[PDB]
């Protein structure tokens with residue numbers, strides 16, 4: 001690898017791992033479009049299995065980027081419109097608070113305060129309908145952003161309905177396969193278990209638990225190689241041969257709402273480049289709190305801006321992930337770890353690496 005990439009990555013990540021007590025980590029840097037990989041530590045401490053370029057990590061909420069792109073692809077296919085009422089796709093949602101809530105609102109956390117989680121007690125399709133029928137919004141649609149798995153998760157479920165495919169089958173056929181993400185999974189097959197890292201929480205080995213709308217909000221597992229290829233695809237969508245997927249990628253990076261210095265896409269979030277990273281490390285967008293923030297509608301949405309810092313953080317109980325990229329510079333990073341550690345530390349390390357290389 002180029003020595004400058006080797007050095008900035010090792011010098012940044014080695015102390016991160018020590019400070020955060022991360023058992024295992026994989027990093028990819030995409031530099032002038034090409035990937036470079038780094039690994040440390042253990043995928044399974046007890047079995048002494050190292051992290052490799054084939055180790056699967058739980059992406060947690062980085063999964064929302066896949067959901068957003070899949071939704072984008074459905075729009076491009078003419079199957080859904082973001083301006084459609086939720087009730088077009090779920091007519092059983094008859095309760096009156098749903099009037100005026102569109103697929104856009106679901107996808108962008110702007111429906112009026114949908115809850116962070118679908119409750120664990122929701123086990124069936126009837127339970128899920130009851131949950132959404134009984135939810136009482138805090139605010140009118142399109143007024144505040146409040147991050148929510150129940151919002152984008154429902155978007156993902158509805159977005160695939162016209163296709164006639166399960167969410168998983170749609171994701172596989174329409175996103176993973178065309179992009180050659182052959183080691184990316186919603187459900188880890190038995191054959192891949194040897195490669196599936198354990199997550200570590202309070203020193204205990206853990207994997208994410210099943211839950212309603214898990215696949216749609218937090219349920220993808222992938223390798224550092226597939227995640228680098230996901231970054232490459234999002235950096236340079238015009239190289240994608242499947243036109244609806246190319247268009248879908250672009251739609252996911254469109255800017256729909258602004259709060260402070262951040263713009264909400266479909267799954268992806270964006271800041272104008274050059275960035276001052278204070279807001280994403282120390283300030284309002286550092287993800288430490290669950291924050292209700294007023295939004296300004298971008299009417300119409302700005303097409304994907306090349307001079308952006310495009311990113312998403314994610315975690316599960318045992319994992320912490322981060323992806324960021326800058327299309328104009330052909331530059332990006334993926335950081336996958338098998339411990340959940342604070343988001344500001346992730347962003348600070350990513351910034352240190354990409355700011356050095358840009």
Ligand SMILES: OC[C@H]1O[C@@](CO)(O[C@H]2O[C@H](CO)[C@@H](O)[C@H](O)[C@H]2O)[C@@H](O)[C@@H]1O
Nearest residue numbers: 060061116117149217218314315316317
């Ligand atoms: O657990 C699914 C999903 O939800 C998030 C928040 O988006 O984490 C929540 O759930 C965890 C498991 O119970 C909690 O430990 C955590 O405090 C909570 O916010 C994601 O991190 C996770 O993938």
Ligand SMILES: CS(=O)(=O)Nc1ccc(C(=O)O)cc1
Nearest residue numbers: 141142256297298299300301
């Ligand atoms: C981002 S857009 O082009 O769809 N414009 C919108 C979207 C939603 C609203 C709202 O009030 O809910 C207003 C304007």
Ligand SMILES: CS(=O)(=O)Nc1ccc(C(=O)O)cc1
Nearest residue numbers: 116146147287288289290291
């Ligand atoms: C602190 S939390 O566990 O609720 N996780 C969050 C909360 C909010 C956001 C956001 O994008 O606003 C992201 C992650």
Ligand SMILES: CS(=O)(=O)Nc1ccc(C(=O)O)cc1
Nearest residue numbers: 083256297298299300301302
């Ligand atoms: C077509 S769009 O996506 O830009 N959405 C808009 C545009 C304008 C207005 C308005 O009230 O002026 C509202 C919503």
